[PDB]
UniProtKB/Swiss-Prot annotation:
Residues 30-37 are annotated as: G1 motif. This is Interferon-induced GTP-binding protein Mx1. Interferon-induced dynamin-like GTPase with antiviral activity against a wide range of RNA viruses and some DNA viruses. Its target viruses include negative-stranded RNA viruses and HBV through binding and inactivation of their ribonucleocapsid. May also antagonize reoviridae and asfarviridae replication. Inhibits thogoto virus (THOV) replication by preventing the nuclear import of viral nucleocapsids. Inhibits La Crosse virus (LACV) replication by sequestering viral nucleoprotein in perinuclear complexes, preventing genome amplification, budding, and egress. InterPro entries: Dynamin (IPR022812), Dynamin_GTPase (IPR001401), Dynamin_GTPase_CS (IPR019762), Dynamin_N (IPR045063), Dynamin_stalk (IPR000375), G_DYNAMIN_dom (IPR030381), GED (IPR003130), GED_dom (IPR020850). Changing K36M: Loss of GTP-binding. Loss of protection against viral infection. Belongs to the TRAFAC class dynamin-like GTPase superfamily. Dynamin/Fzo/YdjA family. Pfam families: Dynamin_M, Dynamin_N, GED. The lineage of its organism: Eukaryota, Metazoa, Chordata, Craniata, Vertebrata.
Length: 520
């Protein structure tokens, strides 16, 4: 309760988690000449977002990005150095008088469009308490500070007001200031406080900061309007310090369960989104082999589905096997047309008044040779298209795997298609082997059937079965050649990087859980 509640969040902040996760905080809103700079001086005792981690010392540190310096006089120079070097700068101070309190200071309001958005970036989170610093003589209605605070915190339930430099309050309107601090104008759950600090003329001398601590108490003890606010514990820096730490702790404690609820669901969101980008490539050579082999197996199964007309397809389209059945139907029609036209051609020679007629049927049969070979070509093209479309679906992220697959797909096409043409072509050399009209016409039906049957079977044999077979064999052999694993498993840098960032994000999220679970 004492100090740990604060130690908790700040280390979660040091985790770099704050980008994935909202951490309980007091954000310090600065105005134009609000003198906020001086108020922090009062608490600390000594621009892109500054984190003030304050710890009060018996026994008796600055970090820009990764690096740090150690000592209290030198602090001023280290600050301005780090800046020149929107990223968090943390400052940890420890002395007997400094409060136990962590604040985050933002650039004061005034390329301005950007500062609002930076400020809004912190303020809009219901886990942020907006700590508004405005000079007390100016109307609070006009101040940009409150307006921002109000834009984000409509009900004033996460905002705290600091009125500054109560000297320059126009005489006659002291009671208006008192109504604001007493909460009578714009109502804040967490309230108002008023403080007096280092003005223009003392910052030039820079007389001692602890002497100023005694300069407040006599300003408020003697002031006729504000003496009443001190009796009510709403005036001075030491009072301000106590209230802030009281309020911070109350916030952190209130916030915890809704936060442990928030980390879980974020963890999920990252892990769900992490799924879409595959998995890591194993360091171990053997695990590498199993990884590649599994990838080969799924390619090889998608190829298999094609071979069997089993592959999963769209509602309108049809399976490759079926598309080849339609080619094969077109082919039968070609046989049918060839058969009858040969019938017409033969009657035009027999009643034109033996082996002259044998030759004529033979020529009618040979004419089918090119339809057959075209069909060979037409079908390999379909399968090649199919096989490469599988290689796309499986190996896009692994371009060498895809490159290699394509290469085999092409190499085995050239080989199988050659073999298929050979057998088709040779089939039409093997073929040279009114009672005459019939004998020839019956001979003609036999030959066609032979041809109508074998040609598709050869096409199917070489360009679908043997083709798929060999390719699968070829791919499966990649797993034997270990010194190519490094090349084959090279993957796209785009998704390779996307995964890398998420794993890092998820890592920091996991540490967070760990430290949060440790605390109770």
């Amino acid at each position: 309760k004492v100090r740990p509640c604060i130690d908790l969040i700040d280390s979660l902040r040091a985790l770099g988690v704050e980008q994935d996760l909202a951490l309980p905080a007091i954000a310090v809103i600065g105005d134009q000449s609000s003198g906020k700079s001086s108020v922090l001086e009062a608490l600390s005792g000594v621009r892109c977002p500054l984190v003030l981690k304050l710890k009060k010392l018996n026994e008796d540190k600055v970090s820009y990005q990764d690096y740090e310096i150690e000592i209290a006089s030198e602090v001023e120079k280290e600050i301005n150095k780090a800046q020149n070097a929107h990223e968090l700068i943390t400052l940890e101070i420890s002395s007997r008088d400094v409060p136990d309190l962590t604040l985050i200071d933002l650039p004061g309001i005034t390329i301005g469009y950007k500062i609002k958005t930076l400020i809004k970036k912190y303020i809009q989170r219901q886990e942020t308490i907006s700590l508004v610093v405005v000079p007390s003589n100016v109307d609070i209605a006009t101040t940009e500070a409150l307006s921002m605070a109000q834009e984000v915190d409509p009900e004033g339930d996460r905002t705290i007001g600091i009125l500054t430099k109560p000297d320059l309050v126009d005489k006659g309107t002291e009671d208006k200031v008192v109504d604001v601090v007493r909460n009578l104008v714009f109502h804040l759950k967490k309230g108002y406080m008023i403080v007096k600090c280092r003005g223009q003329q003392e910052i030039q001398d820079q007389l001692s900061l602890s002497e100023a601590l005694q300069r407040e108490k006599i300003f408020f003890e003697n002031h006729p309007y504000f003496r009443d606010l001190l009796e009510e514990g709403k005036a001075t820096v030491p009072c301000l310090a106590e209230k802030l730490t009281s309020e911070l702790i109350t916030h952190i404690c209130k916030s915890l369960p809704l936060l442990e609820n928030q980390i879980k669901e974020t963890h999920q969101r990252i892990t769900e989104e992490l799924q879409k980008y595959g998995v890591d490539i194993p360091e171990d050579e053997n695990e590498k082999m199993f990884f590649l082999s599994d990838k080969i197996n799924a390619f090889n199964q998608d190829i298999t589905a094609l071979m069997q007309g089993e592959e999963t397809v769209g509602e309108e389209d049809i399976r490759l096997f079926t598309r080849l059945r339609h080619e094969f139907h077109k082919w039968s029609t070609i046989i049918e047309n060839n058969f009858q036209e040969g019938h017409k051609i033969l009657s035009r020679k027999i009643q034109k008044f033996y082996r002259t007629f044998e030759t004529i049927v033979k020529q009618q049969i040979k004419a089918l040779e090119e339809p057959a070979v075209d069909m060979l070509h037409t079908v390999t093209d379909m399968v090649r298209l199919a096989f490469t479309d599988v290689s796309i679906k499986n190996f896009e992220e692994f371009f060498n795997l895809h490159r290699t697959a394509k290469s085999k797909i092409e190499d085995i096409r050239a080989e199988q298609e050659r073999e298929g043409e050979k057998l088709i072509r040779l089939h039409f050399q093997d073929e040279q082997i009114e009672e005459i009209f019939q004998h020839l016409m019956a001979y003609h039906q036999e030959a066609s059937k032979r041809i109508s049957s074998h040609i598709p079977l050869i096409i199917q044999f070489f360009m679908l079965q043997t083709y798929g077979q060999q390719l699968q064999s070829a791919m499966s052999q990649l797993s034997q050649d270990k010194d190519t694993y490094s090349w084959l498993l090279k993957e796209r840098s785009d998704t390779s990087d996307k995964r890398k960032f998420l794993k890092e994000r998820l890592a920091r999220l996991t540490q967070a859980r760990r430290r949060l679970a440790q605390f109770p």
